[PDB]
Structures are given as structure tokens and as C-alpha cells.
Amino acid sequence: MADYLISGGTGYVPEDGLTAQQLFASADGLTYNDFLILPGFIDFIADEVDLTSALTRKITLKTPLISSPMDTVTEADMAIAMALMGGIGFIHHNCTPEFQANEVRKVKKFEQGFNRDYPLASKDSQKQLLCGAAVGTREDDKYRLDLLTQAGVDVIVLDSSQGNSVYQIAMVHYIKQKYPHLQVIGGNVVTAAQAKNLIDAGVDGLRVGMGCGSICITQEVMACGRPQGTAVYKVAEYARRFGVPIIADGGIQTVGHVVKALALGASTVMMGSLLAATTEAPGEYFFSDGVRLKKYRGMGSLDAMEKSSDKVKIAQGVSGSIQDKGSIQKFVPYLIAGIQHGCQDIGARSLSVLRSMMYSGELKFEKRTMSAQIEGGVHGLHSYEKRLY
Amino acid sequence: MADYLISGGTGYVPEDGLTAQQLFASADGLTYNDFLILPGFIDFIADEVDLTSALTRKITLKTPLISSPMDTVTEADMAIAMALMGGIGFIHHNCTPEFQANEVRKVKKFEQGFNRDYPLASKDSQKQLLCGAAVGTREDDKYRLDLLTQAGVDVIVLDSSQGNSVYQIAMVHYIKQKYPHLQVIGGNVVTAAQAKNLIDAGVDGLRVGMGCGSICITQEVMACGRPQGTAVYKVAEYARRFGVPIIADGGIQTVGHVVKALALGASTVMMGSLLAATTEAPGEYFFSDGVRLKKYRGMGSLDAMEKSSDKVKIAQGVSGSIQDKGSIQKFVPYLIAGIQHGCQDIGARSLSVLRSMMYSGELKFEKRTMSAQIEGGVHGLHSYEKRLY
Amino acid sequence: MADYLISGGTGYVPEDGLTAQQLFASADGLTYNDFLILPGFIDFIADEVDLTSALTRKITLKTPLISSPMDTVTEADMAIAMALMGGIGFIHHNCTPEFQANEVRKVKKFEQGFNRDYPLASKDSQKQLLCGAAVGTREDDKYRLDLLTQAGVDVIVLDSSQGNSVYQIAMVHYIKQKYPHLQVIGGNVVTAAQAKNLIDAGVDGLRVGMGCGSICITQEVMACGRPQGTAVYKVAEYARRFGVPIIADGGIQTVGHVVKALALGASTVMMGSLLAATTEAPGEYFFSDGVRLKKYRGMGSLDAMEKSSDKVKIAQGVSGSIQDKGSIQKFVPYLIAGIQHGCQDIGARSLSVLRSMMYSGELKFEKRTMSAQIEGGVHGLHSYEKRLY
Amino acid sequence: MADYLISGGTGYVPEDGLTAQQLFASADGLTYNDFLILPGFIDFIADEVDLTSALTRKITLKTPLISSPMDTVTEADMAIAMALMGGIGFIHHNCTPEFQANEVRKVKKFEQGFNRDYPLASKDSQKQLLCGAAVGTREDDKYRLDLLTQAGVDVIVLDSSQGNSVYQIAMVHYIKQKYPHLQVIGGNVVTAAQAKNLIDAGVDGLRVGMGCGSICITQEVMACGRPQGTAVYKVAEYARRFGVPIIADGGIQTVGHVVKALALGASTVMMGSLLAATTEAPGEYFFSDGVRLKKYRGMGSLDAMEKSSDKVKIAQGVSGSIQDKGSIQKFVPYLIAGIQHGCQDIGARSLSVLRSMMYSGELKFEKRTMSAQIEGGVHGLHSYEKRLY
Ligand SMILES: NC(=O)c1ccc[n+]([C@@H]2O[C@H](COP(=O)([O-])OP(=O)(O)OC[C@H]3O[C@@H](n4cnc5c(N)ncnc54)[C@H](O)[C@@H]3O)[C@@H](O)[C@H]2O)c1
Ligand SMILES: NC(=O)c1ccc[n+]([C@@H]2O[C@H](COP(=O)([O-])OP(=O)(O)OC[C@H]3O[C@@H](n4cnc5c(N)ncnc54)[C@H](O)[C@@H]3O)[C@@H](O)[C@H]2O)c1
Ligand SMILES: NC(=O)c1ccc[n+]([C@@H]2O[C@H](COP(=O)([O-])OP(=O)(O)OC[C@H]3O[C@@H](n4cnc5c(N)ncnc54)[C@H](O)[C@@H]3O)[C@@H](O)[C@H]2O)c1
Ligand SMILES: NC(=O)c1ccc[n+]([C@@H]2O[C@H](COP(=O)([O-])OP(=O)(O)OC[C@H]3O[C@@H](n4cnc5c(N)ncnc54)[C@H](O)[C@@H]3O)[C@@H](O)[C@H]2O)c1
């Protein structure tokens, strides 16, 4: 019985798999599809799994999930639904300042019932729903920010492809002195050197990803960006040294990508395309080839840039369509159950525990070859029907 | 004279290829498609090749092949046919306890003739066919297990996606105390750390693979699993230290995948999709686009979970169809002859010899690039017809 | 302020140094002099440090220190003194069976006072001092073992240069069936492959080291042995999987070697030359060139083999002398204070905690070049006097 | 109990240490002092160890030991004694042809008794002692070789610092056509490329080492040679492909160097300095500072090149003295017992088995750091006396 004397509270666990530190040592360009998380020990049911998540230094959500500040994803209906599910939405800024402040006002005034329960409903002190908003880094964004702070916005995201700029750092120093209470997320960043300049400017969170988004062409136009899994791991590991949470933003096609982003050190995950074409996503449904579709586009797509408007405009995103997904109040419970089940197979009873296992090297990972990615999908069938829930 | 003095019973063999230990040192995600086994020396005919296989610590099969405990693969007709061919079948548990015990009873009472010959017919002491059954890890599975042990079941498989759980370890300790004679296979596991907890619980065999199965989506939903060749090699090497055989389960598309699974240290191989849509697989044939198909589905697909029905259910598998393959009594002889010719090209006269050559580093392997996998398949033709036998 | 959300109970610690696994990855021949342990965090005084140590599966000492079964180190006076200090002594077997049983009898009958205090005095259930004895693997050792078990010996060490033998495994099986209460330490071993056979034979502890001891010539005579730090790490890691403690035996010149041996996974440390030429070490003091010396010799030295006696005898050790060190009741408190201060600088409040930090990767090491070993000694002085306490 | 089914005749052995192939992969300059052989499993007594050794393609000695063709080591008294002990001696050629043929004649005419027993006495078909002789690669060496073959010499060594020459290859072709029965050892070589040219010329054995010998200065004069352990391993591995045995020549200070040389693939070991200053070594004893010494010198030392004398001669060796060792009939039994005990600790019951274990990867090695070489010698004593037997 005296095994406790020879190694204390450890006990022997066979070594198998790679720590996150080893998984990224090779300096390949790993994205979420390129690796798996190895199963752990299960000693809890999947419903016990705590999804409590830092959005910023001060704001805590009960679900890691965020709707992206895009004009085809997040206006007040999306922000209300995401808050009720225990995430948040950032109202997009491809609209007039007064329009965006009116969308924020609708979220802050919602009250519910003015039929279901929302035990994760992600409220502020006054029992109003939490709301985020995007702003740019121009001089008009100072006026927009006056209106949004008057409308009771809880958190601001500085909304750029490349947040490591004098323009953004000046905007951070301006917000943190004029509205010291206001939580500011800087971004986008993909390197620790970008993250250090915004953390030194005093941001309360970071938004991580460049390229990677489903509608994005920044990598093939600008040559610039990073494989998103590697960016999330590198920026989360840097931001963690300063107590700064990160949002893994863009490239999330599946529940398994969400679990990978959280496991690599993201505190929250931001989705455009996964929440696009829901009932709460702005714009109308339409039929093309007998499929109920809704528009979805990059904010640096030409039609997104033509709205509300150096002579030649470089596209950084595409405009397209996503098939109807139903309602956020149906889809986000599927994401929550999928995340909890993923955490349960991993043996983490909490997302804070999941990241603690990753940084301690208790959590183990495994690379996938191309043939392993084929083997991990559906293969060898004549036909099949992938109904996820 | 001098050769024996200078190096004993060795003699010089040029070094070429990698040992299994070197093949997996790189920590890539190798699956079966990612590597080849190098040819050895042939000094026997392929019909000399002994396919004798440990299923558990106590049970030996004269052939390595197992039918998977799936409701579209293994009821009594499959289990009878697989036993007569010298494998075994595990009766699925997506049915009431009395139905599954009646399927087991039909296997144990079969006798043959109540006409081919079955010199590998895989029988117990009383000359009844061997039968396996699946059970879960709930409290109803204790009653199910009582009925199955009354029906004379020879071996139990504990049937989970992630067998390293308190629920499963408790079910192992319960079976081994109440039914000490009964052989228990634990699983599914893909890591040695999972394998150690079930081997310490006292399982008699392990079932290896998570993801990998043709109908499986656990990797894209849960983020969790392993490339199956790597999982088989790692878990077989760990389980071997304790005298525990392993079943390589799922991702077997070809005879070459079976030979690879056995070469990597699997004692037996379990198939769903390769034995699905045979005459003995449960369910009816049907025609769609002029092809004779039969249903094949994951046990964690939604329509499989609906049978005999936490409000939102997460799919871990798809539902689909496989093209008709004929009869087990035709197809399993093709698998046996294919395994024997593979062993003959390798220079192993037995599967025990094959694994001994692998652990001693006598058996050599070679990685395949993507261009080598293309080169290894059919290429450069206008059209062709792949008639396998 | 929610830093706990982003990484749970870990918290950020800069990475510096190597884990023990990395320190031995290079496959150099590291001994204790070849590496340092890096300092940790101090949150306790050195006297709080708990030195409770497993000698075997069942026996616990309150100090990690053992006197070696050598005829110039351990008879009853050494064994009494080492037990009173909270270690143990193994009575040597280079004597008649009746003489060794009489030495053991003197330890078991001691009582104290028939005046310092001994709060670590390392007693049995009946409040007698613990005593070990050595035996060989011949047929006369069965009679010797009968006398020693009648004399009330608590633990047996099987005393060979190379314990992985049929002769030794047979002696283990013989002891464990005839004397099932009796604790057996196997050895000497230096590889996990040797440790496997003795652990499978059923030893309760292992003695680790071959060559390495101050009087050793086994390496330049037999070509056979291992660098002792590497042997301790590799055998302790293997033995830990089975709950078997290890004794790091030989090559301990300093307190820092003891702290290194314990950090590398040794449960206890065995000393010959460090405890030789104390007042309790057998044999007389003598003067040569004006220095008070006592004889110290290997048990495979020719004069040690000439005592109590294939015509040509191979020496495996030398015969020599050590300068007088005083008394065990003065020297072992210096070793204890040195071990506790080493643990305090490391940041481990217990030896069980120290090994837990090492296996978990929290304890970091650092290799020393030859120039770093020079820099870590006394250097650049005209003269100096190294008074240790 | 079917553990044989899962891995055949292998059985599980924990991997620990390096195979010889891995030990030399790093391309350091390992000599014998730089590595250890790890202990194996002992299932035999050391006297069972068979030391039967190929000298050439045709000649077998019962002991691996050869006296070097040096004028301070091997004339007829040494060659007789080495043959009676079950090695051989090569009579040196720093003499006139008639003198060397008379030394060979005395060995071939010896008979014994014209009283110990010599069960290893290393005779030819006619029950005469085996004798070797050296020759050079000049035209006078053709006449010398006529006389030596008339005197009944059994084996010739071609005696050069650098055997990969037109002069030596011509001499090999000349011997093999004029005396087809006569066994020829080529050398010295240290690379496989040198070995390939002499093996293609048709030598029956190789002599391996350049520098390394105790009296060597070839490395600091010529810049040319190899670390002897590495040379033995490389040349033995190459020569083994053709069934050619190797002599490891020079740098043998200890029994452990002999066991290392044999384990690295040497079939026999050649000694100068270890057999110098024995009673059978040519030259007289003399006293200097009260020590009974005998001269020992390199054959390329100036005073060795003066005997039997562009104009400037380069020393390749030193002239010196060795302390008296006694008689070959006392010392060679110590070498034999030391080799057998080293083999017993390693777990090889034969030298053919030892080399088979090394090439198959079963024999494991371990590098020594400088601090491990210190720890492996005598350390931490005031004084000591190293009596070897
Ligand atoms: N994450 C991505 O990979 C990514 C890539 C492209 C676009 N987007 C999104 O599309 C939208 C537009 O992105 P963007 O980066 O093109 O917008 P942006 O306004 O940040 O940048 C456009 C250009 O204006 C410059 N700029 C910004 N503020 C300035 C100031 N005060 N003075 C002078 N120049 C200034 C920028 O450096 C850049 O050259 C945002 O919603 C953004 O998140 C995201
Ligand atoms: N590739 C694979 O290995 C794989 C992947 C997915 C599903 N499957 C198969 O699909 C079927 C279902 O797999 P599964 O893992 O979903 O079934 P499962 O019943 O093992 O697990 C379902 C859930 O219930 C939990 N659970 C199990 N026993 C419990 C108990 N007593 N109390 C409380 N909670 C308990 C589990 O931890 C898990 O959260 C099986 O046939 C399985 O083999 C296999
Ligand atoms: N550093 C070390 O670990 C080391 C090295 C050398 C010696 N020593 C010590 O010196 C002493 C002698 O060591 P040793 O290994 O020479 O003693 P030993 O008795 O274990 O071995 C001596 C020889 O006898 C053989 N032998 C042992 N039992 C036998 C049996 N029943 N039948 C036949 N042969 C048998 C062994 O295999 C070996 O060849 C011990 O105190 C030992 O601990 C220790
Ligand atoms: N460690 C060693 O291997 C080593 C090193 C130096 C010397 N030695 C020994 O010292 C002795 C002398 O060695 P050596 O190599 O100096 O002797 P050597 O006669 O082989 O070489 C001396 C020189 O003469 C040349 N030579 C040889 N045969 C020739 C021919 N027919 N025509 C023209 N040139 C020819 C050689 O190439 C070399 O330049 C030998 O006993 C040898 O084994 C050994």
C-alpha cells in the first residue's frame, strides 16, 4: 500500500501523446483539423461540465460562445439570443453610429416576455442582457463610441484585420482614459508580438485569427496571417502571462473545432459562419436551387465595403450564402452539449480545468496525417446522411 | 565455420526500413494507409500460415476476425457464420435484454445440419459455437448480463466510445466478482493510460479505436480520438506487458488494413462496414439507383439512439448504406487467403511469428508520402475493373 | 481579476530547465556530478521538511539513509546507530551464519539506556529497533536465513553484483514461500529489464547501482555497469509502476549526491564509504602518515573474499582506508540537515513531494559541463579549509 | 495463458540502453573507456562460458587472446605460452629472416615435457602448437615468407600502420597464389573502405587499430587514425558481411577493454603492453628506482627502426618500460576468468552468442560522461591497493 511515499499525490500514468508545447514545437502550420485531443479519465457525467468563460479581464460568460461583429451575423436579435444562451453578441459597425446604438439599446432594454427559462442568460448587474459592439480606429469611431457608451454597451471590440497598429493602440489609450470602466478587446492578432503591444496598451481581451474565417481571402491577397490553431495556442500562451483572455475567432466549422480552440487556451470562441443563416442572423431567407439560403459575407468583401460608401478597393473577403440552420435557441444548445461531451471524453469537468491540464502537460494531443484526417471523417460508405442532432 | 563464430545464429541481413518503434517515433498521426510492411524471406507456402489468435487471456480463435457489436452487423446469423469461419461475433445490445439473450441462445444451440465443412469452427468445450455479446455500463446492463450468462455467452464486450471511466471500471469489477469465469473485453481505448486503468480493473482483452470507424464522426464532434494505426501500436505494446490481447476495431477497409493491424500488434481485428450488407448482416436488402444496398449505421447515430429511447442528443455516427457483398461464407475465406498471402510476402508463417518479428525489430516498415499512396493505388489507366476475388 | 478562469489551478510559471525525462533523453552517461537541480519557491522553513521514506512495500523509515551490508561498515553497532537516527543498517554476511544472527539479535535486543532522545528511532511494532541483514544466493544462505529469521530480522537484502539471475530469482521465490511475512530487497540492478524479473519474482524493494561505489572496479574488470544517476532514474521510474521503492546504492560522496539520488526517484540511499571510518564502523582505527584511518574495502576485494575461505579469483573491488569521521550520531544529523536544506532550496517540503514534482515535470534540472563542474567546486583561491559542519 | 499467441518467442523486455548501432550513431569518438555494456540475465555459471574464437576464415582458437608481433613481446617463448593458453603468438619480423624462421621452428617443434595440463592448447592437425609470424610488404619479405612457410608457420600477418596500400594488396595476391593454404591477416585498418580493399584482395582476417596502442604517437605525428572502439565496431560490422573475423589490436589496458572489444564485434584481441614485461616477453628484467621493469617499445620507435637499419626517420612510437607482470601461464588465466565473468554479467554464454546479441540489438550499451568515468573508477578513498587477482 505505501505507493504514496514513492511519488506523493501523482501515481503512475503511462506517457502517450504529446503535450501542447511538443505539438507545436515542430513549427508546422497546424490548424484544428491537423490534431486530435487524446481521451482522459471519465469520473463525471457530461452535464456536470462547467462552461464558465472569461470574455475579458472583468466580464464572465457562462458559455464560451460569441457571435461575430458581422453585418450578416450580429444585430440585436442575434445579440439577445446569444446573451440568453449565455454567450454574448458584438453588434457590427457596418451601419450608422445611431443605428448601432439603437441595436445596442434594444439588447439592453429586452427584459424577456415583453415562455422558456434561461439559467445561463448572461446579464449585467442591473439584470439587463450583456451586449458588445464593434468600432473601428478612425476619428468617426470616437463619436460612435460616445453613442454606444450612452446606449449602455458593456464591452467594445476594436475591429481590424491587423490590430497591431498605431491607429488601434491610440484608440485603446483613448477608450481606457475617457471610459475607464469600459472593457476593450483588441485585435485581430495572431502573434505574441502583436499581442504584447495591445496588452501594453491596456486591452482587457484579445481577438485571435487572421485568415482562417470561412469568407476570408486575406492570406491569398495579403500573404499575411497564421494557421488558426497555432495562432490560438501562441497568443493564448502569451496573453495568459498577463491574465488576458483570448477569443479564438474564425475557422470554426464544427463542435470539435470549438473544443480544440478551448483546449489550445482560448477562453471564448467567436463564430460567423456557424451562426450565419440562423433565424436571428440579419437579412432574409431566399431560395436558390431549392435550398433555403441566407447571405453571408466578409466585412472586407466589396459589397460590405460598398455599403455606407486609395481609389481601388482590395477585397479581403468573399460574399456568399449559407444554408438555413434554424434558430439560435436550438443550435447553441447543440454546441453546448457537444462541448460538454468533448470535455467529458477528455476528462475535464470544467473549461478552466481543460486549459489547466493543457498547460501542465496532463492533456495530450496527437497529430493527424492526411490519411488520418480521411480515416477520422466518414469513409467507405455508398451513401450516408450526417444528422448532427 | 567462421560466420557462426563471428556472430552466432544471426548471419548478416542488410538494414533497410524502419522498426515499428522507429516508425512511430516521429509522432505523426499514422493510420494504416500511411505505411507499408517490407517483404521478408519466403520459405513456406501461404496455406502453411497459422492464423491462430488470442481474443482474450483465455479464448483462442483459429482466425483473427470479429464481427462488430452493431445492430446493422451482428445478430445470431452473423455470429453463427463468423464462428463457423473461425472468428466470433458479438451480438449487439441495441435491443431488449430478452431479445439479445435469445440471439445468443440461437448461436449456442446451432449444431450445424439441423453442407460445407468448418475445420476452424471456433467452438467451446461442449462443441457449441462461441458467442460474444455487448453490454453497456448502466444498471439495466446488470440484468442484461444475468440473462446473457444464463444464455451461455462466452465473452462480454463493454461497449463504449471511451472505456476509461468510473462507470466502466465498476462494471468490470462487478462482472469479475459475480461471474468470475466470464471473459471481459474493455474499451474503447486508444491510449496506454486508458489501457492501464482497464487492465488494472482486470479485463481479459481490450478493444482499440476511437474515431476511425467508417460511420464514425466522434473526431469532428468531440475533438477526441486517435489515428488508428498509432492507437493499435501504442495500446498493443502496452497491453502486451500484462499478457492482454487487443482487438483493432474500426477503419478496416481492405485485407491490407487487417494485415497492418495484426502486424502492429493487434491479436484480432473487428469489422463493421466490411461485413455489413452481407447476407448474414441484419436488415433487408433494398435498391437505390439500381444498386442492391443494405443499411449500415453507427450505434451513436441519431436513428440508432432513437431505438429503445440530456434532452438534446449528440450524434457520434452517421446512418448510411453499403453495397451488397454476398455471404460471410464467401467473403471471410477471401479475407483469410488475403491475410495468409500478406503474411507469406512478409515471411511470417504465423501471426504470433509476425508480431514477434515486429517487437524484435526483424519486421521492417516504410512510410508512404501522399504521392506514394497514389502510386500504390490504381493510377494512369483510362478505365479499370477492381475484381478482388 | 478572473485569471483562474483562463488556466484553473496551474498559474503561469516561466519554463526554464529540463524535466528529468528530458535530462535523460540525450542518453549520455549522467552521474550525480553531471547535473544540478534548479531552485524552486520557498514557503516553509527547512525543519518542516519531512524525510519519511519507503524502504520496501511495507517498511517505512523516517530518514532515507541506509548503512551498506559491508564488513567494514555494518555490524550491530552501526545498525543500532542507524536505526536510532531513523535509517536502518543491513548486517553484512562476510561472517558465519551464527555470527550474523548474533549481530541481528544485539540490534533487536538493544532497548536504549541498558542519554540523548531519538524521535526518529525507526522501531518495529514491539518497540525494538529495525534490523536488516544480507544473504547470498547459495544453499548455505537458506540455513543462514533460518537463523536470521529466528533472530528477528525485519528485512533481507539479496546481496549480489548482478541480481538478475536464476540463482537470485530462485532465492526470492524460496524466501516469499517459506517466510511470507519477510520483506526482501532484490539487487543489484541498473536496468528496467533486470528490475522486471526481480519485481515479477516478488521483491519488496530494489537495490540500484553497479560499479559506482567508491571501492568499485567492476566496470574496468567486467565492462559492465551503469552511470549511477541514470541507473537510479531508469530503475526508479520502472519500479514506481509496480509500487516498488528503490535504494540508490554506491557513489554517494556528498549530501548533494543524496539529494540528487532522492530527486531522481530513489526512496532511500545506501552508503558504504560515507559511513565507513565512523566510530560504529567495525575494525580499529590506525595511524598512517599521522592520519587516523580505518580500513574500508569492497566485498569483492581479494582480502574480503579470502576471509571465510574457479581456482583464480577475480577482484571486483579494492581494499583501502578512509579518514576518521567521528560518530554516526554526529554525522547523520549533518546528512539530515543537509537533505532538508537541499529540499528547502528546491521548494519540496517532503521527499514524497520532491519525487512528485520530478515525475510531474515541475522539478527542473540542468546539465553541467566540465567547466561548470569546476565553477561549482572551490576555485580561484590560494588556499582554503572545507569545514562542512 | 496464451501470452505466446500475442508475441511468439519474444516475450516483453523493457527497452533500456542503446544498441551498438545507436551507440555509434552520434559519430563521437568513442573508445573503450567511453561506454559500458549493460547487464543481462544470468542463467549459467561463468565457467560454462565458451570463448571459442575465429582467428581467420579457417583457424579457430579456444581463447580470443593474441600476442602482438613486437620485438619486446613475441618470440618463441611467448608464442609457445600463448598457444598453450589457447591463444596464439605472432613472431615479430624486426630480425633477420633466418632468426624469425628459427623462432617459428621452436614453436612448431615444442611437444610439451621435452607439469601442468593445457586443455585449450591450440594445436594444428599434427598436434604441433599453432604459430603466427609477421612479414612486411617489401621484396625481402618474399624470401622471409619462403623461410617461414618452410618452418611450418600456420598464419601470416601483414604488418603495417596502414594496410590499405598497393604494396600490401600486391603482397596478399602474391601470398594467396604462391601459398594458397596459408592464412593471411591484413592490416592495420580502421575504416570499412580500407577493409573492403584487403577483403577484395582475399585476406582471411583483419587487424584493426591505428594509433590506440600504449606506445602509439601516430595520431599526433600523422594526424591519422581512429578511436579504437569505433574502429573495431565499424570494421567488424563491415568484415562480418564477408565472413571475415577481426583482431582488435592495441589500446587494451584492462580485462574490461577485452570484453568491450569482443562485444563490439572483434573475434580476437591482440595485446602488446598487457603481455610485455612477462617472463616470456623477450629482453631482460632490470631495476630502476627499485622496480623490476622490462623494455617495451613501438616497432616504429627510433631505436626499434635502428635495428636492421629520405635520410630523416619519423618516429611513430615511443620506447619505454613496463613493470614486471609475472608469467603468461599466470596472467592469461586471469584474463580468461575476467572475460568469462564479464560474459556472465552480460548474460552471454559464448562469445559467438555475445556478438549475436550485439548485432541483433539485444545487447545494450550506455555512454559514460567524464564524471561517469570518474565514478566508475576508484574514488573518495584516502589510500587503496588495487590487487586484481
Ligand atoms: N481577421 C481577419 O483576418 C480579417 C481580415 C480582413 C478584414 N477583417 C474584417 O473586415 C473589417 C475591415 O477590416 P480592415 O482591417 O480592413 O479595417 P481597418 O479599418 O482596420 O483597416 C483598413 C485600412 O485603414 C487603415 N487604418 C485604420 N485606422 C486608421 C486611421 N485612423 N488612420 C489611417 N489609417 C487607418 C488600416 O491600417 C488599413 O490600412 C473588420 O470587420 C475586420 O475585422 C478581418
Ligand atoms: N469509435 C468508437 O469507439 C465509438 C465512438 C462513439 C460511439 N461508439 C459506439 O456507440 C455506442 C454508444 O457509445 P457511447 O460511448 O455513447 O455509449 P456510453 O453509454 O458508453 O456513453 C454515453 C454517455 O453516458 C455516460 N455513462 C455511461 N455509463 C454511465 C453510468 N452508469 N452512469 C452515468 N453515466 C454513464 C458516458 O460517460 C457518456 O457520457 C457503443 O456501441 C459504442 O461502442 C463507438
Ligand atoms: N556495485 C555492485 O553492485 C557490486 C559489484 C561487485 C560486487 N558487489 C558486492 O560484493 C559481494 C559479492 O558479489 P558477487 O556478485 O560477486 O557475489 P555473488 O555470489 O552474487 O556472485 C558470484 C558468482 O557466483 C554465482 N552464483 C551466485 N549464486 C549461485 C548459485 N546458487 N549457484 C551457482 N552460482 C551462483 C554468480 O552468478 C557469480 O558468477 C556482494 O556483497 C555484492 O553486493 C557489488
Ligand atoms: N598502430 C598501428 O597500427 C601502427 C602505427 C605505426 C606503426 N605500426 C607498426 O610499426 C611497424 C612499422 O609500420 P610501418 O607502417 O611504418 O611499416 P611499413 O613498412 O608498412 O611502412 C613504411 C613506409 O614504407 C612504405 N612501403 C611499404 N612497403 C613498400 C614497398 N614495397 N615499396 C615501397 N614503399 C613501401 C609504406 O607505404 C610507408 O610509407 C609495424 O610493426 C607496424 O605494425 C603500427
Ligand SMILES: O=c1[nH]cnc2c1ncn2[C@@H]1O[C@H](COP(=O)(O)O)[C@@H](O)[C@H]1O
Ligand atoms: O472580409 C473579411 N475578410 C477576412 N476576415 C473576415 C472578414 N470579415 C470577417 N472576417 C473574420 O471572420 C470571422 C468569422 O469567421 P467564420 O466563423 O469562420 O465564418 C470574423 O469574426 C472576422 O474575424
Ligand SMILES: O=c1[nH]cnc2c1ncn2[C@@H]1O[C@H](COP(=O)(O)O)[C@@H](O)[C@H]1O
Ligand atoms: O455511432 C458510432 N460512432 C462512432 N463509432 C462507432 C459508432 N458505432 C460503431 N462505432 C465503431 O465503429 C466500428 C466499426 O467500424 P468500421 O468497421 O470501420 O465500419 C465499431 O466496432 C465501433 O467501434
Ligand SMILES: O=c1[nH]cnc2c1ncn2[C@@H]1O[C@H](COP(=O)(O)O)[C@@H](O)[C@H]1O
Ligand atoms: O567489491 C565490490 N565491488 C564493487 N562494488 C562493491 C563492492 N563491495 C561493495 N560494493 C558496492 O559499493 C556500495 C558502497 O559504495 P560507496 O558508498 O560509494 O562506498 C555497496 O553498498 C555495494 O553495492
Ligand SMILES: O=c1[nH]cnc2c1ncn2[C@@H]1O[C@H](COP(=O)(O)O)[C@@H](O)[C@H]1O
Ligand atoms: O611504433 C608504433 N607506433 C604505433 N603503433 C604501434 C607501434 N608498434 C606497434 N604498434 C601497435 O601497437 C599494438 C600494441 O598496443 P598495446 O597492446 O596497447 O600496447 C601493436 O599490435 C601494433 O598494432
